[PDB]
């Protein structure tokens, strides 16, 4: 049978993610009682909810069966779950399809492989070492401002958001004075269904509001990135903007500008927001588990383990969708050609078949098998930059912290997509 309606709504509807406790209890109910069922929520297409770690890997390693963008019918699947009214808005705007960005999540092989190869080498761990000193100087400047501002703050809006934004805009080539604009458009982009992040220029209460906000935000990013692409093509620099802006295909022709736009939107949004969420979630966990803060100050070589367990627990990228290109049997269920799937990375990260005491914050999981970056050819391109920035910041910050106390009510972004904390009121004790 269909998944029970209140479990299905908890995961599908963005409002279901406002509070992590009922959300994670819904993922757990499925993993334990209905690990592969179809959610049939009013206003949404039917979705197979992929809740089990093994099933996330099985789907993601088979892109010839489970497409992101619809395969040869390009744009026939939206990889980022919108409601039906929203997908209808987008088909009206684009003319029949949902490919509103040329960014990697919307692409299938072989197009996906050709475009990803433009930046694959730049993002490898050996090619990121040249940025470590600049990252460390940025972390140290951010920590100097934290110490100067005193012990009482919102660890998100008054600390964690700034470091990853400055890192990516510096590597990317965007000037420091444009950081506030990029931060505002990132809030619009990941806040399409959050009541406190509504744009002024869209009908907030329309059935397709989130889709209108998504489209409006992308148009603003395009306007900004068109100037940057033309600038770097005219005058190349040694920055990531140039690598993407000047990229040419196998025939020597630039990729269409929208392909650069797509990289730039992904880097300008996911490139800082997920890292900020993970850092704030790490601070929240160190408040709950002060013995962990003591241990990592005692042995700074535990910092990568702390980053891996923060990634597993926070898991800020909650899903992407796939479509079945053929019928496929999994876990005793018959997925039919055309059926959509929702990949629940946060649920995979709590799967008791893989993780002992999966809700416990345990930095001693070695290896830490988390799937917070996903899997398969679409696996996070930024993962190594994220792990480096979080390592460098924790190496510089934790010596300066004796204790983190949460002094006020935490707030999460209301989204089923790219979430995590927007507010974490703390009282810090500095060393
Ligand atoms: C804590 C940090 C982050 C987490 C947890 C995260 C997580 C994810 C996840 C789960 C996916 C989807 C993988 C899949 O479809 O199987 C993804 C995709 C992606 N992420 Fe990350 N991300 C992080 C940081 C970053 C950064 C720093 C960048 C860029 C600077 C980035 C760029 C991307 C891009 C471009 C994609 C699309 C890849 C594709 O579809 O081929 N991410 N990320």
Q: What is the resolution of this structure in A?
A: 1.5
Q: Under DSSP, is residue 399 helix (H, G, I), strand (E, B) or coil? A: helix
CA 327 remoteness from chain centre? 29
Collapsing DSSP states into helix, strand and coil, what is residue 16?
helix
Q: Which atom of ligand 1 has the smallest separation from the CA of 116?
A: 41
Q: Which domain holds residue 343?
A: 1-431
Q: For residue 272, give the ligand 1 atom closest to its CA.
A: 27
Phi-psi region of 95 (alpha: psi -120 to 50; beta: other; left: phi over 0): left
Under 8 Å between Cβ of 356 and 59 = no
The CA-based angle 270-273-275, given to 5 degrees, is 100
Which residues lie below 8 Å from residue 431, measured CB to CB, with a gap of 6+?
Answer: 399, 400, 401, 402
Cα separations in angstroms, 78 against 46, 128, 149: 13, 31, 43
Ligand 1: which atom is nearest the Cα of residue 263?
A: 35
Q: Which of 163, 151, 78, 162 is nearest to 388 (CA)?
A: 163
Binding positions for heme b: 112, 322, 375, 378, 380
Residues with CB under 6 A from ligand 1: 60, 104-105, 116, 168, 266-267, 270-271, 274-275, 278, 311, 316-317, 320, 345, 372-376, 378-382, 385-386
Give residues after which the chain gaps, C-N over 2.5 angstroms. Answer: none
Cite the annotated binding site by residue number. 112, 322, 375, 378, 380
Query: How far is the C-alpha of 347 from the C-alpha of 360, rounded, in Å?
Result: 14
**Structural domain count of the chain:** 1
Helix (H, G, I), strand (E, B) or coil at 430: strand
> What ligand 1 atom has the least distance to the C-alpha of 385?
27
Task: Return the best residue to mutate from 113, 349, 382, 418 for the ligand 1 pocket (most ligand atoms within 8 A of CB).
Answer: 382
CA distances from 179 to 1, 110, 116, 140 (A): 49, 34, 26, 18
Spatial separation of the C-alpha atoms in residues 261 and 272, rounded to whole Å = 17
Of 405, 424, 153, give the one whose Cα is nearest residue 288. Answer: 405
Experiment used for this model: X-ray
């Amino acid at each position: 049978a269909a998944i029970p309606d209140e479990i299905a709504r908890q995961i599908v509807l963005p409002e279901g993610h406002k509070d992590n406790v009922p959300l994670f209890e819904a993922y757990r109910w499925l993993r334990e009682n209905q690990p592969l069922g179809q959610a049939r929520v009013e206003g949404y297409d039917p979705l197979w909810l992929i809740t089990k770690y093994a099933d996330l890997m099985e789907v993601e390693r088979q892109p010839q069966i489970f497409a992101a963008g619809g395969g040869e019918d390009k744009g026939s699947n939206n990889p980022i779950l919108a409601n039906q009214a929203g997908d209808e808005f987008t088909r009206q705007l684009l003319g029949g399809n949902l490919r509103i960005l040329d960014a990697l999540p919307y692409l299938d092989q072989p197009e996906h492989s050709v475009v990803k190869d433009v930046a694959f080498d730049w993002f490898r761990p050996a090619n990121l070492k040249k940025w470590e000193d600049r990252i460390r100087e940025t972390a140290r400047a951010s920590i100097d401002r934290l110490l100067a501002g005193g012990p009482d703050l919102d660890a998100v809006q008054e600390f964690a958001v700034f470091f990853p934004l400055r890192v990516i805009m510096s590597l990317f080539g965007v000037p420091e004075e444009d950081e506030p604009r990029m931060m505002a458009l990132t809030q619009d982009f990941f806040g399409v269904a959050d009541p406190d992040a509504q744009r002024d220029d869209i009908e907030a209460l329309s059935p397709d509001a989130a889709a209108q906000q998504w489209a409006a935000t992308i148009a603003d990013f395009y306007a900004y990135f068109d100037v940057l692409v033309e600038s770097r093509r005219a005058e190349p620099r040694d920055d990531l903007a140039t690598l993407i802006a000047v990229a040419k295909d196998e025939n020597g022709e630039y990729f269409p500008k929208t392909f650069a736009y797509g990289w730039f939107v992904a880097i300008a949004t996911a490139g800082h927001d997920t890292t900020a969420s993970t850092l704030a979630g790490c601070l929240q966990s160190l408040a709950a588990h002060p013995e962990v803060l003591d241990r990592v100050k005692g042995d700074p070589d535990l910092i990568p383990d702390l980053v891996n367990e923060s990634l597993r627990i926070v898991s800020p990228v909650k899903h992407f969708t796939r479509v079945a290109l053929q019928d496929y049997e999994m876990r005793g269920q018959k997925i039919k050609a055309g059926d959509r799937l929702m990949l629940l990375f946060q649920s995979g990260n709590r799967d008791a078949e893989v993780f002992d005491r999966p809700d416990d914050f345990d930095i001693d999981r070695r290896p830490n098998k988390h799937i917070a970056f996903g899997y398969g050819p679409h696996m996070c391109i930024g993962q190594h930059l994220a792990k480096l920035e979080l390592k460098v910041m924790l190496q510089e910050l934790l010596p300066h912290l004796e204790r983190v106390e949460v002094s006020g009510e935490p707030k999460l972004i209301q989204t089923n997509f790219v979430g995590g904390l927007r507010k974490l009121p703390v009282h810090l004790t500095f060393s």
